[PDB]
Amino acid sequence: MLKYIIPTIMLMPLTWLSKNNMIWVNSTAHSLLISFTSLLLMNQFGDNSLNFSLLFFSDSLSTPLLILTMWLLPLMLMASQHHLSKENLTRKKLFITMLISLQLFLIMTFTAMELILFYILFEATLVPTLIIITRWGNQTERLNAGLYFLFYTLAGSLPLLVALIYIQNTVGSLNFLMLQYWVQPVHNSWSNVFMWLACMMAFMVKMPLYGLHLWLPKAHVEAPIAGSMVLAAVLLKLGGYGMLRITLILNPMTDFMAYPFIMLSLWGMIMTSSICLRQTDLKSLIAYSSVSHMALVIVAILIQTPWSYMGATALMIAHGLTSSMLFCLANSNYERIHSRTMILARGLQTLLPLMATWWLLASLTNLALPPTINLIGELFVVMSTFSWSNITIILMGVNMVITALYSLYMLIMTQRGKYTYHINNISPSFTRENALMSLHILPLLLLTLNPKIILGPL
Amino acid sequence: TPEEKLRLQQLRELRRRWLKDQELSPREPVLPPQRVSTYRHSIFAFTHVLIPVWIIHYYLKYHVTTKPYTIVEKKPRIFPGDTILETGEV
Amino acid sequence: LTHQQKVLRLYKRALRHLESWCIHRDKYRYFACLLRARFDEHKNEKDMVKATQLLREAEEEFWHGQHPQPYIFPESPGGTSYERYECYKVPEWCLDDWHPSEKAMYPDYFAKREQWKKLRRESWEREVKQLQEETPVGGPRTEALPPARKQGDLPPLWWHIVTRPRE
């Protein structure tokens, strides 16, 4: 990024500097102009590699990944205006600035050129997201969930500084991933096991496992106003890509102990899907779906040998658009019914026929309709782990069968009769409710036309 | 039962009266409003079928000279020997 | 439910289960009076176990061999196409928000629509005047006086008095 952080930091002295209610139409207007500058200088060729300028950017050469990072800020401001307009103007503008500040660290992140600038940027988040949970959230039991939102990610990430500086003083310098040509092998010891352990375990804190993931249905359950930072929390979970940066080198040959990370993420994969068919919350309903086929990608990486890097490149953005779109469905149907419990929503499909199409195609991306961006990568996870052994198709295939029920378990809940109630919930899906509901599948199937850019090195 | 006698007498004077109300169409109450506005078989099919013939055939004549594998038509399946060749068969 | 009317709940379904199995009409009709002679065993007697043992042996041979996929009268609690008309499904009061040039059609219908509301807008000086009075403390099924002692409007006005018609 030559000048990508440079225009967007100038957007910050524009919120409180501006007038009254013009601040929404002004902030969205400037924001889309950067989106072309993202597209233009990137997407170049391309053969190993594009070292961008200097010691602050390697241009995201092997995986682009950065276009998706920039849709969301001109996408959530139209969403957050549902229930925010009740406060002072100076307090509302602070809520605008902290979300814009969230993007700037993540703009320098995902490229990052290095590793010692990585970790300070890997931890540069969690400061604005935590404040969003504290002020202007929902009802109580927020503050413990704010503490569970800490004390896991910070608990696991601290041995990375134990790991990385131990590498920096030992073999060369980790400023350059491309000066990582000389890499000594790592043998089996009782010291080197922990060297691989601290190198990996912090990345399991963000993309979850069957262990240590109780915090994840707290921030999504107890969540801000109407899915406001919850959409950003989608990129916060998928943005643990850095295992692709690190373990591609830097003890690759330790696979003797890969197995309890293969197995735990596999029986826990089939389990946490069925752990929500008796859940009674809408915002928890997509949350446990977002565990399962996000836990699919982990066995695509620790198992090496591409035809596995191909799909895993695409499976990060797979639910990254989809679960963001499902939260947009769940952020709607709450300004009209002020409880998020799904059972009270009997008698839909007749009052809102226009958004009923949007329920269909959204949940048609979990069955996923094989000419899409979802079942084009899940076939390559099949193509990899079947070469591992012949058993792996069984537990992974039932995951394609449980979410078949688990997605249509939501769709049929819309179709009921006589609705018993609801002198409120009149509003027949205004312009903000459906224009914001667009621009998700509209690039998604667009990317299914020529899906060449969604591919790693690989 | 003598209790519901006064019931369903005024209800027929309310529910069917509401249905007397619901039966209501004053002079076909569509405005629409504003505004306005077999043998041919001349352009209803000609726009339908006769136009996309030339476009897709151009997409195949400009295709064989470019792609090295055009139509991959199979063998002759010929039992005698014929005039397309020079020899014959019994 | 009482013991005497417990006979009636079985008596209608005793013959209703039989026409499921018949092939003719008279074949079913010949067994109507033929089954009546079994019902004419004890015509009028006391209400004690002698009337219960007539029902205690009506446990068997009534549930025993009962209705092998019977007639269902399709507009029913069961049966096919029982709630089939649901593409319409009568959304009564879906017509609040219009933002007109869509309320252009039916002019006289909306002029009568606000008219009926004053019957509901002014009932709680009369309906709630007897609602505190007609219920003794917290007792049984709470229909009002079915004329409401001057004018019954409705008492169930208006979601039941303008309830959903079928089509």
Add this chain to the structure above:
Amino acid sequence: ASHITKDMLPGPYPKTPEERAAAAKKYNMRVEDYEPYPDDGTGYGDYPKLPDRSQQERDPWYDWDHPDLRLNWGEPMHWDLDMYIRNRVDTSPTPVNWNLMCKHLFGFVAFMLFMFWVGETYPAYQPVGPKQYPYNNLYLE
């Protein structure tokens, strides 16, 4: 903002008659076969006083059920026993437990031994000895 008996509590014998119904009217006057004694067996993480389980169950099945809506669709007020397993489940039919389908699937279990036999059309059986002579024994001449 409902705080008074907002959920269940550590029951089930903290004057269980004062549970139902000072609030959470699952029982009328603690003798309705639905007093909050039915904490299954406690000690576990089950339901406490829990206006919950072993009350009369196995179906809300969308019956005739006209005195209110009251079956499953139309919100009776406070009769919650168990949920999230019943929008697709039912009551007892006319037949009873008898697992005759395994005996019905046992019809091929006799013919599963017939899968070992052969199926040549001609000639007939004559199953008495080796005079059937299946394959080639001798040469041409």
Add this chain to the structure above:
Amino acid sequence: LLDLIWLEAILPKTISLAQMKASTLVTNQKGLIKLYFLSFLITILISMILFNFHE
């Protein structure tokens, strides 16, 4: 019953364990300056014998 119980067993033990052991450190220090200073000489005598502190 397993996911929010037997995963709520090991980590909320840690907060309760520290809050058990934060309760034994302040509530036993309510004045009694006679009882403070006899414990400081325990510190200065145990430092002689125990370790490399004189060698």
Add this chain to the structure above:
Amino acid sequence: TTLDPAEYDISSETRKAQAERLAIRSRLKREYQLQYYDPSRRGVIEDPALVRWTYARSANIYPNFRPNTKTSLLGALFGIGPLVFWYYVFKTDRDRKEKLIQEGKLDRTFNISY
């Protein structure tokens, strides 16, 4: 199977004063319809049976819980049980395949993919 379901029993005259259990609910039904019928509500009913349902199910089970019984420690036979067993399958796997891949060959020679 599930169930008989015992749709008939005896009466006359067991528990003559047991009736009017509908008086509990019809008072609530009178409290329901009086809340339901009004000229201006514009909102949902509070319906505290669903309030007391999820919150005493999703939460308030861990304050209820104690490990004072082994049938609460019975989840060791379901969680970690098969989780060892899949690895007990898989540790026997991938090495028997490897020994035939190391010593001797069985694959086709045109296995570029993979």
